[PDB]
Amino acid sequence: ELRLLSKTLQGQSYRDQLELNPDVSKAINNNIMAVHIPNNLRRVATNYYKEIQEPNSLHRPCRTKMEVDAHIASIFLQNYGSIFQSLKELQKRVGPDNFKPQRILDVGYGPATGIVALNDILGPNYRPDLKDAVILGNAEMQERAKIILSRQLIMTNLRSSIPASKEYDLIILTHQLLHDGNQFPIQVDENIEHYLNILAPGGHIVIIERGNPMGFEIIARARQITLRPENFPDEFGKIPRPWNYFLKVIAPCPHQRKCPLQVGNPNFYTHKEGKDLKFCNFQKSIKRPKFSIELKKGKLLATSWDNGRDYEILNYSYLIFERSHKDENTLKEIKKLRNENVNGKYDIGSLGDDTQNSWPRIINDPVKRKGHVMMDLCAPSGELEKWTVSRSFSKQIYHDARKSKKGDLWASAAKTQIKGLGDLNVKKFHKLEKERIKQLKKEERQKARKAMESYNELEDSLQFDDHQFSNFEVMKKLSTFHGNDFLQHVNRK
RNA sequence: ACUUAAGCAGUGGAGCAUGUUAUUUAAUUCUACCAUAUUUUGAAUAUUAUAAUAAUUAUAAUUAUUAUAUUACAGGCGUUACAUUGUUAAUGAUCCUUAUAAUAUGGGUAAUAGACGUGCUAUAAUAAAAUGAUAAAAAACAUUUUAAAUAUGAAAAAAGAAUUGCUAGUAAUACGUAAAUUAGUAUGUUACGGUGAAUAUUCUAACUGUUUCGCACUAAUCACUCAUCACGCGUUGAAA
RNA sequence: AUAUGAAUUAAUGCGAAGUUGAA
Numbered sequence: 001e002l003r004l005l006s007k008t009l010q011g012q013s014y015r016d017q018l019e020l021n022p023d024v025s026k027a028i029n030n031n032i033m034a035v036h037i038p039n040n041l042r043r044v045a046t047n048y049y050k051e052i053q054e055p056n057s058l059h060r061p062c063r064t065k066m067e068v069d070a071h072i073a074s075i076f077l078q079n080y081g082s083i084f085q086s087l088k089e090l091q092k093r094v095g096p097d098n099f100k101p102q103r104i105l106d107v108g109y110g111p112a113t114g115i116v117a118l119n120d121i122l123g124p125n126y127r128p129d130l131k132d133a134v135i136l137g138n139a140e141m142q143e144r145a146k147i148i149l150s151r152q153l154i155m156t157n158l159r160s161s162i163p164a165s166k167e168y169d170l171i172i173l174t175h176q177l178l179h180d181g182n183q184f185p186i187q188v189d190e191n192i193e194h195y196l197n198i199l200a201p202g203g204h205i206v207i208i209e210r211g212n213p214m215g216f217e218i219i220a221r222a223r224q225i226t227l228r229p230e231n232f233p234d235e236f237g238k239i240p241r242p243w244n245y246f247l248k249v250i251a252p253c254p255h256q257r258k259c260p261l262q263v264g265n266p267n268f269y270t271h272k273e274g275k276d277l278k279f280c281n282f283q284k285s286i287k288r289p290k291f292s293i294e295l296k297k298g299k300l301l302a303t304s305w306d307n308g309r310d311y312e313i314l315n316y317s318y319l320i321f322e323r324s325h326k327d328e329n330t331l332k333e334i335k336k337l338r339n340e341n342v343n344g345k346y347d348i349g350s351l352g353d354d355t356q357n358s359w360p361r362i363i364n365d366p367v368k369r370k371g372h373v374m375m376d377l378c379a380p381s382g383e384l385e386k387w388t389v390s391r392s393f394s395k396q397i398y399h400d401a402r403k404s405k406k407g408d409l410w411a412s413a414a415k416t417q418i419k420g421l422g423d424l425n426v427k428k429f430h431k432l433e434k435e436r437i438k439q440l441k442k443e444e445r446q447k448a449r450k451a452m453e454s455y456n457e458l459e460d461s462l463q464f465d466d467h468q469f470s471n472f473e474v475m476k477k478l479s480t481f482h483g484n485d486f487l488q489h490v491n492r493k
Numbered sequence: 494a495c496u497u498a499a500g501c502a503g504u505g506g507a508g509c510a511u512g513u514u515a516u517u518u519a520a521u522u523c524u525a526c527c528a529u530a531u532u533u534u535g536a537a538u539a540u541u542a543u544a545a546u547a548a549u550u551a552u553a554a555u556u557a558u559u560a561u562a563u564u565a566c567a568g569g570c571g572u573u574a575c576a577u578u579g580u581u582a583a584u585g586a587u588c589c590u591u592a593u594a595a596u597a598u599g600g601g602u603a604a605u606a607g608a609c610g611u612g613c614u615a616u617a618a619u620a621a622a623a624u625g626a627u628a629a630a631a632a633a634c635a636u637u638u639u640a641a642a643u644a645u646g647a648a649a650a651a652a653g654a655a656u657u658g659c660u661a662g663u664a665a666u667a668c669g670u671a672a673a674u675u676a677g678u679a680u681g682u683u684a685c686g687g688u689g690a691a692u693a694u695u696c697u698a699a700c701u702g703u704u705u706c707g708c709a710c711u712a713a714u715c716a717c718u719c720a721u722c723a724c725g726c727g728u729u730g731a732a733a
Numbered sequence: 734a735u736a737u738g739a740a741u742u743a744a745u746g747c748g749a750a751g752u753u754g755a756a
């Protein structure tokens with residue numbers, strides 16, 4: 001626990017090692033797995049892992065009870081850390097006082113997972129009115145969710161579908177903005193819109209995803225459709241955005257403008273040219289409990305599939321929105337803020353409003369050498385930035401930057417604040433796609449003359465009938481002519 | 494059909510070794526890190542000048558060299574969320590230039606509540622110790638002694654989860670030899686030979702692919718369909 | 734009887750996101 005500076009404290013993110021409640025670990029390893037002989041649980045967990053090892057895949061509901069317990073094993077470990085960190089980010093950014101939500105909803109394939117994390121977070125003295133929690137996967141998951149929640153302090157209401165006769169002030173989503181690899185662009189909009197309807201005034205939505213390029217794509221698309229950066233050009237900073245309804249981003253994003261890292265299609269992470277592309281992931285460390293230690297052992301699961309750790313480094317992407325309060329106050333407040341005080345063109349190097357909301361976020365592990373720390377930042381201006389701190393520019397700023405880590409908000413000035421030039425090829429890619437759209441319309445027009453001259457050549461020497469073109473090849477042209485015709489037909493659809 | 498049950502061979506609580514994590518720290522780097530002093534064209538190339546040296550022209554002019562200044566800069570174990578080549582360091586781009594460069598001293602990389610992996614040695618008598626034939630790229634044989642926390646071990650005894658392999662020149666060997674990294678270090682890896690067993694498979698079995706049936710499922714059983722509970726809007730039917 | 738209106742009243746159609754059963 002370092003002195004650093006008071007501002008550096010608010011800037012820093014929760015870096016402590018993660019741990020499950022010992023009661024919960026004892027409960028799981030005593031009941032949920034002791035009856036099961038470990039081999040079958042390991043087999044079903046391995047099955048679950050193998051079908052996500054595929055590039056840019058998505059997680060799936062747990063079909064059968066053995067897969068149910070295997071999901072309790074493998075993914076509770078990861079999702080608990082993800083939610084715990086994201087909720088800590090939320091609590092700290094909004095302040096510890098504003099976060100006393102009464103109406104609580106959690107959606108995810110796992111057990112009541114946001115519920116347990118929230119309980120552990122704000123402590124065992126917390127007894128709201130409502131603690132609804134839907135479990136998508138299986139009925140057998142709810143009894144084990146009850147088992148887990150019993151050891152903590154039940155009022156949690158285990159459902160199977162979203163109750164839609166009530167609004168909520170706190171909502172958590174885990175792996176819910178998509179369910180199919182295909183249909184990716186649009187299911188995110190449908191799913192998010194489904195939940196934004198049931199977010200009460202002043203509430204918060206906390207979305208957590210896998211943290212691989214597909215997941216980053218999901219968060220980026222959700223942010224784009226919700227904020228709509230293009231609808232408010234030249235508007236820097238964070239003012240709530242429409243979607244009598246208004247929403248703003250709490251974290252990780254430090255700007256409401258477009259995401260600099262967004263490339264539209266996940267599949268292009270799979271190409272040779274996409275071998276250096278980068279995405280807004282976020283790592284954390286959590287120490288393995290007994291069962292994982294007992295579980296992740298054997299040739300099947302504890303070897304190179306072809307030394308051990310006490311902990312897992314989990315990747316996840318996440319997003320948060322804060323909702324404004326329905327009132328004669330907030331609406332006019334937002335309207336006037338958008339009218340009379342634009343926050344100007346925040347320059348590269350700027351710190352935004354110089355409050356925790358608009359601080360640059362450290363989106364890569366800072367690289368540290370003698371005297372100087374360099375940082376890769378998503379800036380409140382919104383461009384990728386390399387900021388270098390030195391012993392020269394100061395001693396204290398160097399001290400703080402030299403303890404800086406990924407996922408922290410850096411909150412000071414630097415001697416150089418240049419653009420993050422490297423792997424900004426997403427901006428080069430934004431050119432390529434727009435090239436295609438304009439030149440796509442040349443493609444059909446080229447294809448017209450390409451096929452016309454081919455057939456005009458055909459008819460000349462087939463009307464003249466010298467038949468220099470072979471019977472095999474001539475009938476090949478006719479195949480191309482009609483085949484090209486049909487392919488144009490369906491492309492209209 | 495792994496695996497299990499059996500039989501056999503074992504290993505598994507102790508320590509260290511070797512790492513990792515955490516916590517701690519001014520650092521506990523990823524000599525490269527911390528504290529205190531201390532150097533600013535520095536390491537090179539060029540410019541432009543005053544000093545000597547030469548060569549010329551004519552003391553001066555020029556050219557060099559050599560110093561001293563001279564600033565472009567040099568320098569950077571800075572960057573790959575800095576690229577392209579090259580390979581399995583370079584160019585470029587950018588960043589620092591009383592500092593991110595340079596030197597010195599000391600300190601750290603070895604801190605220790607914990608936690609986990611990898612191996613070696615132990616815990617005695619179908620087995621250790623002392624003494625006396627054979628390889629490829631010494632165990633063996635012989636004799637004797639041998640306590641009961643020792644004369645074992647260089648805490649460790651009793652019981653457990655776990656786990657490794659199962660006819661084979663395989664396992665195991667308190668059997669050794671050798672190579673590379675190396676100025677020096679191996680309990681790590683690699684090969685390389687010598688000796689050469691035990692023991693038998695009722696059983697269970699996920700996963701598992703074929704499959705058979707039905708389907709009203711087609712995002713595929715969390716599938717779809719049906720009924721309930723509420724809100725409004727209609728349509729028609731009787732009517733004192 | 735052929736119509737036209739009616740307090741009172743029967744059934745059913747639709748749709749909004751859902752709520753409840755497991756036919």
Ligand code: SF4
Nearest residue numbers: 252253259261280378
């Ligand atoms: S790069 Fe910045 S804007 Fe994009 S998702 Fe990450 S934090 Fe948000």
